[PDB]
Amino acid sequence: LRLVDGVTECSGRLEVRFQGEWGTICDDGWDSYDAAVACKQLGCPTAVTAIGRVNASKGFGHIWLDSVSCQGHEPAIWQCKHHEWGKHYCNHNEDAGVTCSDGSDLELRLRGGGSRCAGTVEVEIQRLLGKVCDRGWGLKEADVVCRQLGCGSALKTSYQVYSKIQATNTWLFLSSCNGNETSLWDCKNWQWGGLTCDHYEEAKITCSAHREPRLVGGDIPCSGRVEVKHGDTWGSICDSDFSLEAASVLCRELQCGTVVSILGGAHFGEGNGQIWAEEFQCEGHESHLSLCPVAPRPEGTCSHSRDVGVVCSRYTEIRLVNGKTPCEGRVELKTLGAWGSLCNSHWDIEDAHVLCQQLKCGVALSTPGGARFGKGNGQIWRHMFHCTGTEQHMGDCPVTALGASLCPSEQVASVICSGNQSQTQLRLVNGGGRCAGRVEIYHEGSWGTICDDSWDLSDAHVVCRQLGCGEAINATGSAHFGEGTGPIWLDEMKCNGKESRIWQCHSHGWGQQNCRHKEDAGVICSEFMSLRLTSEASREACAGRLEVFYNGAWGTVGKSSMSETTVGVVCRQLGCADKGKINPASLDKAMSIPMWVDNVQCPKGPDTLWQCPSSPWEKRLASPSEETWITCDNKIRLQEGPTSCSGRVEIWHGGSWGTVCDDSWDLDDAQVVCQQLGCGPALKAFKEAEFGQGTGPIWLNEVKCKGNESSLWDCPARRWGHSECGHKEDAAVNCTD
Amino acid sequence: GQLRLVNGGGRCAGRVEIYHEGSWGTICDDSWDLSDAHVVCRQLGCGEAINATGSAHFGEGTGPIWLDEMKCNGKESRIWQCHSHGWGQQNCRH
Numbered sequence: 001l002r003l004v005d006g007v008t009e010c011s012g013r014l015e016v017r018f019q020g021e022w023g024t025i026c027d028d029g030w031d032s033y034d035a036a037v038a039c040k041q042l043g044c045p046t047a048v049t050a051i052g053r054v055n056a057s058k059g060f061g062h063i064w065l066d067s068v069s070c071q072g073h074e075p076a077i078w079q080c081k082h083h084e085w086g087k088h089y090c091n092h093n094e095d096a097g098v099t100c101s102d103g104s105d106l107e108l109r110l111r112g113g114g115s116r117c118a119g120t121v122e123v124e125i126q127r128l129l130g131k132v133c134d135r136g137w138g139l140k141e142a143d144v145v146c147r148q149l150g151c152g153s154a155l156k157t158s159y160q161v162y163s164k165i166q167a168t169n170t171w172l173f174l175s176s177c178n179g180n181e182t183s184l185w186d187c188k189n190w191q192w193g194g195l196t197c198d199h200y201e202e203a204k205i206t207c208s209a210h211r212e213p214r215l216v217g218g219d220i221p222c223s224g225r226v227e228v229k230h231g232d233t234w235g236s237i238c239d240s241d242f243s244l245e246a247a248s249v250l251c252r253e254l255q256c257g258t259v260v261s262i263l264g265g266a267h268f269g270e271g272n273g274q275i276w277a278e279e280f281q282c283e284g285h286e287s288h289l290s291l292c293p294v295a296p297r298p299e300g301t302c303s304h305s306r307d308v309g310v311v312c313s314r315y316t317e318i319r320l321v322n323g324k325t326p327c328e329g330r331v332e333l334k335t336l337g338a339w340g341s342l343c344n345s346h347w348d349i350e351d352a353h354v355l356c357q358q359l360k361c362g363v364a365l366s367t368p369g370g371a372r373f374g375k376g377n378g379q380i381w382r383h384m385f386h387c388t389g390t391e392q393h394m395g396d397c398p399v400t401a402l403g404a405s406l407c408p409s410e411q412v413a414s415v416i417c418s419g420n421q422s423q424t425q426l427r428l429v430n431g432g433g434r435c436a437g438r439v440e441i442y443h444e445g446s447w448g449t450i451c452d453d454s455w456d457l458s459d460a461h462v463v464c465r466q467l468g469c470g471e472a473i474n475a476t477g478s479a480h481f482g483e484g485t486g487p488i489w490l491d492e493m494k495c496n497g498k499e500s501r502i503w504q505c506h507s508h509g510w511g512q513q514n515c516r517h518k519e520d521a522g523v524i525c526s527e528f529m530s531l532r533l534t535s536e537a538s539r540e541a542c543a544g545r546l547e548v549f550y551n552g553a554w555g556t557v558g559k560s561s562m563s564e565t566t567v568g569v570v571c572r573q574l575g576c577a578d579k580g581k582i583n584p585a586s587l588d589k590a591m592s593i594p595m596w597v598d599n600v601q602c603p604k605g606p607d608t609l610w611q612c613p614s615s616p617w618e619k620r621l622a623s624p625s626e627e628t629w630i631t632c633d634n635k636i637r638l639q640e641g642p643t644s645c646s647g648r649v650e651i652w653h654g655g656s657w658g659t660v661c662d663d664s665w666d667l668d669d670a671q672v673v674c675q676q677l678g679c680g681p682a683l684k685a686f687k688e689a690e691f692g693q694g695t696g697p698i699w700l701n702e703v704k705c706k707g708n709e710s711s712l713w714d715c716p717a718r719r720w721g722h723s724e725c726g727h728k729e730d731a732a733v734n735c736t737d
Numbered sequence: 738g739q740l741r742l743v744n745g746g747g748r749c750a751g752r753v754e755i756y757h758e759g760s761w762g763t764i765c766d767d768s769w770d771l772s773d774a775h776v777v778c779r780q781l782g783c784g785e786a787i788n789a790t791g792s793a794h795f796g797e798g799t800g801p802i803w804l805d806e807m808k809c810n811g812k813e814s815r816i817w818q819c820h821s822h823g824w825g826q827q828n829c830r831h
């Protein structure tokens with residue numbers, strides 16, 4: 001037995017001698033055990049044994065064996081089962097070969113991509129280059145390939161072409177891999193060399209640690225400065241290189257839910273280290289940042305005073321603390337920087353389901369009451385979740401803490417859930433809230449409405465009782481909240497008002513109706529909430545007296561201990577700006593509406609005032625000096641300019657600051673901007689980001705101000721909320737001081 | 738290795754297109770100045786450049802964008818001889 005025409009003395013085409021002459025062996029039936037016995041027979045290492053002839057040429061003469069089967073026990077090849085000598089039909093393009101190695105000389109890399117863990121799969125076996133064949137290439141094999149290199153799960157069979165890759169002749173053919181072994185070399189029956197990859201492409205792969213994201217520096221679970229890892233090294237991101245879609249993808253990968261806001265500057269503290277120069281181009285629907293396209297720049301980057309930060313929805317920090325097992329005990333959550341136990345008063349089983357689905361262990365069995373699992377360490381939090389049971393995290397549930405009633409002495413929430421992780425209706429729509437809108441009922445695997453015939457407050461009481469919304473204030477019909485689509489399930493509802501569920505009423509029966517969709521029913525319940533700033537000029541202005549809607553009536557909110565964060569939440573909820581200032585009461589005209597709530601303290605997470613803890617609702621008559629008046633900061637600002645009111649234009653919307661593209665930017669729009677800021681006539685309207693690149697998303701494009709509008713949103717704009725623009729074309733203005 | 742002008746009403750005016758990687762593509766207008774236009778005109782034998790235009794003055798193109806950030810010094814013989822971010826390295830739109 002001999003090996004010829006190979007890289008070393010331990011690899012090459014295999015030859016056998018008979019009658020005095022050497023001859024070749026056919027590769028059919030030649031498996032890894034045959035190569036193992038061939039390596040063992042010769043004086044060569046046998047730790048790793050592979051099939052195939054490496055860079056060897058075609059055979060010559062007779063083929064003296066075919067379709068052997070050694071099974072690995074027989075010391076020598078000819079002791080195995082084999083066919084008739086010389087009498088076989090293989091041509092000289094099918095000659096066998098063997099590749100024996102110690103196992104410390106085999107190494108595979110990824111080349112052509114943006115990091116260690118994205119590219120074409122290049123293989124180094126005994127200092128000979130190669131590639132892996134597309135034939136049979138799938139994510140299940142890519143998983144072991146990127147497990148051996150030290151990266152995460154494979155995600156795609158492609159990559160971005162960062163650099164060109166040289167050509168190679170050999171090829172590596174891979175059989176099916178079980179998907180759990182810790183190296184590609186451990187896959188069964190992999191061939192090195194021999195066969196050609198005709199009608200097939202090279203193996204490509206992209207895996208998780210290509211662009212792995214992270215959030216650092218925040219005081220709440222799902223907010224902070226954004227950092228990304230390019231395989232091995234971490235780096236911050238410029239606020240001008242990150243978009244709203246990229247933020248959505250980032251917070252989807254990290255399990256933080258939907259994006260609440262992008263924050264520029266260095267909101268969460270300046271970082272240290274590398275700043276990347278890649279502009280993301282996510283379409284929004286990706287699952288990992290690694291899958292997004294990116295545009296690198298060879299030039300320099302921003303300063304560290306422009307690191308992007310993100311705030312996302314899942315800001316609730318909830319846990320089970322005291323109990324026999326880590327998946328049962330008292331429930332605690334931290335807000336306003338302090339831990340506290342929840343209130344049982346409006347805590348039910350559907351909430352426990354999401355509590356222990358968040359913690360990834362089973363489903364809830366019961367909700368023990370009282371001090372059975374421990375008393376609170378101090379003050380009790382009065383938050384009331386309204387989970388529907390189908391969401392995987394508490395931050396996805398509707399929450400309310402504004403005006404919640406004070407709890408009794410020792411009613412504290414607790415939960416017990418099973419360990420088996422494998423364990424796995426009315427809705428109000430179009431009402432501007434959760435406890436108001438058109439009523440839809442889910443009975444036969446589809447959502448349907450209810451007729452307004454015989455529809456009165458008596459049935460609306462049942463509707464607002466089953467959903468967790470208190471009592472009924474309005475029982476509307478005639479499709480007040482818009483026409484529905486789907487079945488009309490119920491008619492002639494005759495609830496007595498004390499029922500607990502809607503179907504317990506003496507209706508005519510499912511599908512027994514004579515209605516159209518213009519007769520869909522709706523409700524407005526007592527727990528409906530709305531916020532308003534009132535002034536004489538307009539009832540929905542951006543500066544005036546603050547009012548809240550509750551129990552069907554409008555009232556005012558006291559100014560006691562009103563912090564900056566609370567006014568920020570108010571302004572952001574109303575859509576005015578990111579922050580505002582309290583004022584002494586105006587003197588134009590004050591209606592005598594009562595006051596609803598006071599002592600409102602908002603944490604840093606929520607973007608609605610309904611989630612801020614406060615004292616319980618209490619209607620009182622109080623002096624106008626105790627009223628809350630707010631002026632929200634301007635919705636448009638000019639930044640980085642040499643004076644107060646010249647520079648780059650930025651606009652607040654959707655919880656984030658952004659910029660205006662310059663595709664149709666002109667002096668007529670600069671007039672509007674300067675007038676809005678209260679500055680003299682416009683002089684120049686710039687283009688192509690004269691005063692530097694912007695922050696956040698591009699909120700506007702092709703604005704069409706006529707030159708006399710009172711604000712930019714009075715102007716027409718064919719684009720609003722989405723733009724085919726980059727940050728390199730931000731608009732700026734120069735006005736008279 | 739071919740350079741072409743399209744939609745300009747003549748062979749010595751219009752949108753610039755480069756044939757590479759088996760397809761026609763465009764050049765971004767970022768830093769597109771009179772010197773790069775001079776190089777194009779010299780390559781096509783059309784003399785000295787008079788206008789260098791951007792913002793798709795001759796109409797939005799189709800196909801990939803091949804070169805951004807052209808920094809020709811004005812004396813180059815062929816356009817691809819200039820400094821640039823490389824084939825396909827772009828952050829532009831049509």
Ligand SMILES: *[C@@H]1O[C@H](CO)[C@@H](O[C@@H]2O[C@H](CO)[C@@H](O[C@@H]3O[C@H](CO)[C@@H](O)[C@H](O)[C@@H]3O)[C@H](O)[C@H]2NC(C)=O)[C@H](O)[C@H]1NC(C)=O
Pocket residue numbers: 004005006007008054055056057
């Ligand atoms: C397929 O691959 C093997 C592995 O490289 C090839 O074997 C190598 O062939 C080259 C010729 O290109 C030999 O180079 C020569 O080496 C001697 C050393 O004394 C020197 O005198 C010559 O000037 C020349 O450099 C090389 O020795 C040989 N072996 C190794 C270990 O590199 C093989 O030829 C390829 N083809 C086939 C059909 O197997």
Ligand SMILES: *[C@@H]1O[C@H](CO)[C@@H](O[C@@H]2O[C@H](CO)[C@@H](O)[C@H](O)[C@H]2NC(C)=O)[C@H](O)[C@H]1NC(C)=O
Pocket residue numbers: 473474476
């Ligand atoms: C909800 O019901 C209230 C009354 O409980 C309605 O308020 C009245 O609205 C009418 C106009 O339709 C006014 O003339 C009255 O002054 C309002 N108050 C009272 C006490 O009658 C309210 O309009 C209803 N809302 C909806 C959406 O149906």
Ligand SMILES: *[C@@H]1O[C@H](CO)[C@@H](O[C@@H]2O[C@H](CO)[C@@H](O)[C@H](O)[C@H]2NC(C)=O)[C@H](O)[C@H]1NC(C)=O
Pocket residue numbers: 787788790
């Ligand atoms: C090509 O450049 C010339 C300048 O060399 C431009 O001609 C000027 O255009 C402006 C704007 O309409 C006029 O005010 C000037 O009077 C024109 N002449 C000169 C000598 O400045 C010409 O418009 C440019 N063409 C294009 C298509 O961009």
Ligand SMILES: *[C@@H]1O[C@H](CO)[C@@H](O)[C@H](O)[C@H]1NC(C)=O
Pocket residue numbers: 641642646683734735
């Ligand atoms: C704005 O315009 C005034 C008046 O022309 C000029 O003095 C000033 O330098 C301009 N500012 C900038 C930043 O160009």
Ligand SMILES: [Ca+2]
Pocket residue numbers: 452453519
């Ligand atoms: Ca009716």
Ligand SMILES: [Ca+2]
Pocket residue numbers: 454455456458459493494495
């Ligand atoms: Ca009724």
Ligand SMILES: [Ca+2]
Pocket residue numbers: 451453491492513514515
């Ligand atoms: Ca009816």
Ligand SMILES: [Ca+2]
Pocket residue numbers: 662663729
């Ligand atoms: Ca532009």
Ligand SMILES: [Ca+2]
Pocket residue numbers: 664665666668669702703704705
């Ligand atoms: Ca305009």
Ligand SMILES: [Ca+2]
Pocket residue numbers: 766767
């Ligand atoms: Ca440009």
Ligand SMILES: [Ca+2]
Pocket residue numbers: 768769770772773806807808809
């Ligand atoms: Ca240039």
Ligand SMILES: [Ca+2]
Pocket residue numbers: 767805806827828829
């Ligand atoms: Ca560019």
